[PDB]
Amino acid sequence: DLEETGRVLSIGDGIARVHGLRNVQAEEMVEFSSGLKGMSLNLEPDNVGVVVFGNDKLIKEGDIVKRTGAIVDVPVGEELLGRVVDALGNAIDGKGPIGSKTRRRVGLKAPGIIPRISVREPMQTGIKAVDSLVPIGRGQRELIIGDRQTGKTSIAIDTIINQKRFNDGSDEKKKLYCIYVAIGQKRSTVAQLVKRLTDADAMKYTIVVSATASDAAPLQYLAPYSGCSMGEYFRDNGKHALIIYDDLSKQAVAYRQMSLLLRRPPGREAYPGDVFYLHSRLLERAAKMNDAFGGGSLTALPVIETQAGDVSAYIPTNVISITDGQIFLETELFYKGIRPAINVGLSVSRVGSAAQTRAMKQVAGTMKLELAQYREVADAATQQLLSRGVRLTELLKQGQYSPMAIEEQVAVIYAGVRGYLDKLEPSKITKFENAFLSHVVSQHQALLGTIRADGKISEQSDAKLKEIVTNFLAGFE
């Protein structure tokens, strides 16, 4: 019966020409006799071109293709938290099947103008440089762009681990469920990442979608949309989600493979004409909703890898045109030990300023201004600018897998911007920072608790801070 069932005519180049399937819809999931799945791409007068989600080795000429009647969708819900799935929603962690009750199409259009509201509440990364200078809000699209091995995945992982302090509490408003989409990475890297999230107890609120380097190009193309659907579930049911696409460069390369194998006209760098639409329709789905639509959000942290620091290339500029700002990571800084190697003159957050808390604003306006002066200078005043800027740049450094609470960042930046560190020599800034942070955590949980509950620094808290920092700097090496 050639109306719900077809036979493969040709296979190769990742596309299977199927004869029959007369009632198949465009963009519908089909199921091959081998157990593989595909998507109806080209409905033609005499055949159906099917994008195979897997290896062409498993599909032969003459194989039976049945249609599932459903436009391509993935399982969504709370039942995916803690699971590692592939681009189709099948669990690859061996913990059994996903018990999901709801499915959601992967190519749903982003919300319109009316369902949205401005980004107002903060998405805390726990990274001092980000949380202070490039603040991210819930519903934003912030790009993490840089060369290879500059610390991009580390920023994303620190954010995910940071969300634990909110996901363990009772404030349901302030929770954030994370989705990590691995696209074209090494499988061992994703396994080690999932272990890092399991040690930090960050997997219980994280979904990992894995389309690695050995997976077929259609799977690496589909993975970001599957992850985005899993996040749109939370965004549309009143909750808040964060999604990392690591990275969209390899997804664009997978899509270019698929497009060149379909014999479509290449453009700049042999990329198809719709490589911008590929990322735009995806990153538009990260939105902050107004309260008549639940009030939830979906934050996107796409990752892009540049070649020799070239950020004016085709795909980098496309994504810069799509997102709400970018966090540049430089190799020249990363080699010099400044880590996270965030370029502060080039990174920006267009809509995150309205999300920064009041305390962090109080310290970060001054920090940002002093850093701008230190940049614009590099006698007896410019020397003070240089000294303050150097102290601040050592204050911005941070370690891996240890994100900080917002009040601790506020305390450290406070010590930095009022001028207490001008006494120490730059090589001692990190020593002072760690010792002082441990001191304030141990014996001053009341001031930190007050700053955290108040969201700002009152003159009472400002006085207590000045007292504590003067005493510590007095009794310090």
Binding site: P111, F276, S353
Partner: protein, 466 residues
Amino acid sequence: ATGRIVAVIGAVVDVQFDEGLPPILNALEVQGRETRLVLEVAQHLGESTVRTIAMDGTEGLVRGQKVLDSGAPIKIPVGPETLGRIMNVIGEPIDERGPIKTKQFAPIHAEAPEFMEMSVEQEILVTGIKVVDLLAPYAKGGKIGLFGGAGVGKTVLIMELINNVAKAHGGYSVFAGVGERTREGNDLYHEMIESGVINLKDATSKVALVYGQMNEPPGARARVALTGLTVAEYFRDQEGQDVLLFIDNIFRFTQAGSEVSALLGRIPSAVGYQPTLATDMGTMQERITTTKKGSITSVQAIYVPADDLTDPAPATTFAHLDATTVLSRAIAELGIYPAVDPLDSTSRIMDPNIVGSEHYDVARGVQKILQDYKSLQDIIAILGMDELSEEDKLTVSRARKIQRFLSQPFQVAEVFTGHMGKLVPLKETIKGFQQILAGEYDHLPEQAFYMVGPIEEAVAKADKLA
């Protein structure tokens, strides 16, 4: 007339008609959809089959699905009832405020105004932006183009122009959002509601919004600019009104045309673009014009792919404009904002008989000294500053002061810069630049001219630095 779908490839749909083949550009309605899926006839393929471009997503289309012919192209509501409302590419309201109850409808495909309707008058339009007003001034009823790569400030500049011109404007205004961020459209909507330019309670609204954004399939992104054109053309012709048309971004029209041209079966041109890029752009751009029936001052942001000004799309747009503001990434990395390239921005009213000999001489002298600095750049880069003449050192110092003084804080940029915006009158701009060229401030440091308004603020900042 009713046809049936025979092929669906992306945004392109083939429809075979037994009776009554619909003309090219007619709008077709697909039957059996939850929402309105409009197909626009693009080609007659032969054997009673047409090839169409879908204005929405084609997922769920089955071969054999019925399609009705409307008998006319896409018709949108035009009139004063569209003011304060948001409509999409096919004229449907997307602001949840009910139907747009206009008394007429106009097809989005129309002929360009004839040669005998053109208007030649070229009065200036002062914007309050120092570099624009000085070096490449805009003209009322003219076509303005803002070129720039990704993240150089096209949206910031166009929002500054909406703030500086459209509120002070006496006529109507149309903002066509073409293939841009949806959250930017939400921001613009709500900003116009608070600033009173859009009124949700009565009929005093002064702006009509048309949005097909970067989440839309390529057919909607290719025709939403035409929908905005149609609204502005109604205001210009049947009302005789002075119209302000802001298009951000107009490059997405060409990019969407390229995306669909892939599938319409056409041999690609240079850089993979459609072979019809220039004639499509011309058909669209010739309707955005001032006739002797009414005026349209048009501001268009043109995206520059990979910062390549020689790309076919911006290179083709260059010929359609009276004033071009070319933003530069290299200038934006020097902290100078707006990132206008002063030796790449032009205007046709930069003419002594139009702006006066004082304005013209100041602008030409500024450009001369900036070109001389650019010529010295290599020697300055390798052999250092000290291997120059004294006249070359004076040229470098004055050129750097002028570079700084071309920057300016915007009122739309206050939120992420803290500096209050400045609106500098044309007299004060000409005076300040005449004075810097004269040498009246060769003693002040260059960093005193950075991010100020008039030259008095420059001397105040110099006095506060020392």
